[PDB]
């Protein structure tokens, strides 16, 4: 569940950092380049209204590209790295389940029930969903006006 986020996160970030220091020296000794990769631009995107999408992508980036390819190269830390990954997923989870921290990863209630209601029809649902396309267009047009007007 979610206590619409009071503060359980602090410790989760700490767990993350704690999980990192066990691979810190390794990768930092290993990385002999001095240019910054996570440009402050990333931070400005995070501090931007596309932020959520920025945060989800980067998190996906590490869990899918980076961490996987790293444990790939040197299986020594493959353990400690994977653990940082589990530690990173436990973070994401607690995020997309509360206080508008990761809305850009949350399924929609209505869209689920409406999908269930449909699937529970079949032949009949394929017809009622299409014959309601006008209402659909209407809702979309409503969503839009919530931006071009009050």
């Amino acid at each position: 569940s979610c206590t619409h986020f009071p503060g359980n996160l602090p410790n989760m970030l700490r767990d993350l950092r704690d999980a990192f220091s066990r691979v810190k020296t390794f990768f930092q000794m290993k990385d002999q380049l001095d240019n910054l990769l996570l440009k402050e631009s990333l931070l400005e995107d995070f501090k931007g209204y596309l932020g959520c999408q920025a945060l989800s992508e980067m998190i996906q980036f590490y869990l899918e590209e980076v961490m996987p390819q790293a444990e790939n190269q040197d299986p020594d830390i493959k353990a400690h790295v994977n653990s940082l990954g589990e530690n990173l997923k436990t973070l994401r989870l607690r995020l997309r389940r509360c206080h508008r921290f990761l809305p850009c990863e949350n399924k929609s209630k209505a869209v689920e029930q409406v999908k269930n209601a449909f699937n529970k029809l079949q032949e009949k649902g394929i017809y009622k969903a299409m014959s309601e396309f006008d209402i659909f267009i209407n809702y979309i047009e409503a969503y839009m006006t919530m931006k071009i007007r009050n």
């Binding site: 996160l9 602090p10 410790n11 970030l13 700490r14 950092r17 704690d18 220091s21 810190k24 020296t25 930092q28 000794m29 380049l33 001095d34 240019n35 910054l36």
Partner: protein, 205 residues
């Protein structure tokens, strides 16, 4: 042997705006030998020499890293110099960021009231710290403290309490005597280590 050995290792040891570089000496070094301290700011490929020759095993790099808590950290290196010969550079293994700053408190004064004593945790305000960069400013939230209390006429034992404010209270149940206090700070989201503060007692009687 036509070469001069390099310092075994270089590592930072820092407190809030007390960023000191350390390094072990080269095996059997002469007194004419000194170390040259260099500095690199992550994100800029450019090494700078802070000290061309230091006859020590430490160097206060504060002044040249005052914008640490608003950066991505540094990298330092040291090489030995004797005559016209020097060593390969020995660089810190990790990147010195805010993660390697040992937390500490400025001081803790106490007051005797009733069934309790209350303490205020004065945070560190180093002179070298540019006014905009206060402790409460850098570690804006999640600041906590470990409190160790000791009854003076007594043995060397401690009661441990945990507070989440720079201010706290301790119940003086009844007994008189004296109460010595020491605090250890942390930030719930950071995993930085902390150093227990200097004893600080108060004459209840």
């Amino acid at each position: 042997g036509t070469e001069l050995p390099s310092p075994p290792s270089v590592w930072f040891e820092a407190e809030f705006f007390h960023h000191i570089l350390h390094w072990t000496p080269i095996p059997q070094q002469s007194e004419s030998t000194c170390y040259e301290v260099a500095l690199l700011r992550y994100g800029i490929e450019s090494w700078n020499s802070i000290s061309q020759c230091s006859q020590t095993l430490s160097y206060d790099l504060t002044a040249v890293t005052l914008d640490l808590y608003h950066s991505n950290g540094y990298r330092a290196r040291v090489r030995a110099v004797d005559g016209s010969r020097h060593s390969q550079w020995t660089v810190t293994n990790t990147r010195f960021s805010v993660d390697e700053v040992t937390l500490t408190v400025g001081s803790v004064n106490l007051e005797i009231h009733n069934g309790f004593i209350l303490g205020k945790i004065q945070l560190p305000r180093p002179k070298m710290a540019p006014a905009q960069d206060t402790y409460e400013s850098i570690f804006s939230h999640f600041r906590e403290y470990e409190i160790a209390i000791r009854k003076v006429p007594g043995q060397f034992t401690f009661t441990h309490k945990k507070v989440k404010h720079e201010q706290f209270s301790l119940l003086t149940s009844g007994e008189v005597g004296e109460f010595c206090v020491q605090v250890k700070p942390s930030v719930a989201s950071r995993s930085n280590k902390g150093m227990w503060s200097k004893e600080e007692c108060i004459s209840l009687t």
